[PDB]
Motif scaffolding. Sequence first.
Motif, short mmCIF file in Angstrom:
data_model
loop_
_atom_site.label_atom_id
_atom_site.label_comp_id
_atom_site.label_asym_id
_atom_site.label_seq_id
_atom_site.Cartn_x
_atom_site.Cartn_y
_atom_site.Cartn_z
N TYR A 1 8.66 11.77 -22.39
CA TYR A 1 9.37 11.10 -21.30
C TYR A 1 9.05 9.61 -21.27
N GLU B 1 -0.51 5.98 -17.00
CA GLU B 1 -0.29 5.85 -15.57
C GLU B 1 -1.59 5.57 -14.83
N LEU C 1 0.82 -1.21 0.00
CA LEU C 1 0.00 0.00 0.00
C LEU C 1 0.86 1.26 0.00
N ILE D 1 2.14 1.80 -3.44
CA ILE D 1 1.15 2.47 -4.29
C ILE D 1 1.16 3.97 -4.03
N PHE E 1 -2.87 -1.70 -10.21
CA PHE E 1 -2.27 -1.83 -8.89
C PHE E 1 -3.31 -1.72 -7.78
N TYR F 1 9.67 5.82 -18.56
CA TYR F 1 10.00 5.29 -17.25
C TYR F 1 11.09 4.23 -17.37
N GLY G 1 -4.39 -4.42 -4.91
CA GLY G 1 -4.37 -4.09 -3.50
C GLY G 1 -5.72 -4.24 -2.83
N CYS H 1 -2.03 2.33 -12.49
CA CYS H 1 -2.40 2.48 -11.08
C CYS H 1 -3.76 1.87 -10.80
N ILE I 1 4.27 5.59 -5.50
CA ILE I 1 4.20 5.67 -6.96
C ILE I 1 3.30 6.83 -7.38
N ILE I 2 2.14 6.96 -6.74
CA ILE I 2 1.23 8.05 -7.08
C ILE I 2 1.88 9.40 -6.78
N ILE J 1 4.60 10.13 -9.49
CA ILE J 1 4.05 10.47 -10.80
C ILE J 1 3.39 11.84 -10.76
#
Lengths: 37, 44
Positions: A34, B32, A19, A22, B39, A36, B43, B36, A25-26, A29
Motif C-alpha cells: 500500500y 509511520e 494535536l 495527530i 510530528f 499514501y 507538537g 509520527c 492520523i494515528i 493509520i
Amino acid sequence: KTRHNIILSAGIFFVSAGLSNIIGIIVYISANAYSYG
Amino acid sequence: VIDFSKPFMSLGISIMIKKPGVFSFLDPLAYEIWMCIVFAYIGV
C-alpha cells in the motif's frame, strides 16, 4: 485591537487543531491495520 | 540385458533452489512510526 486574549485564543485553537490532527492520523493509520496519497 | 562397467561417475537425487540498504537502520520501526515521531516532536 485592545483585546489581546483573542490572539491567545487563536494560538490555542491552532495548537489544539494540530494535536487533533495527530490523533486523527494515528487513528486512521491504526484502523488501516500500500501507499499514501 | 547389457553389461555395465564400474561406475565412472557417482550421483544421486538432489534439491536445487534459487540462490543491506543504506538506510536499513530505520528498519526496526515502521515508516509511520518515524513520521509520527517527527510530528509528536514538533507538537511537544
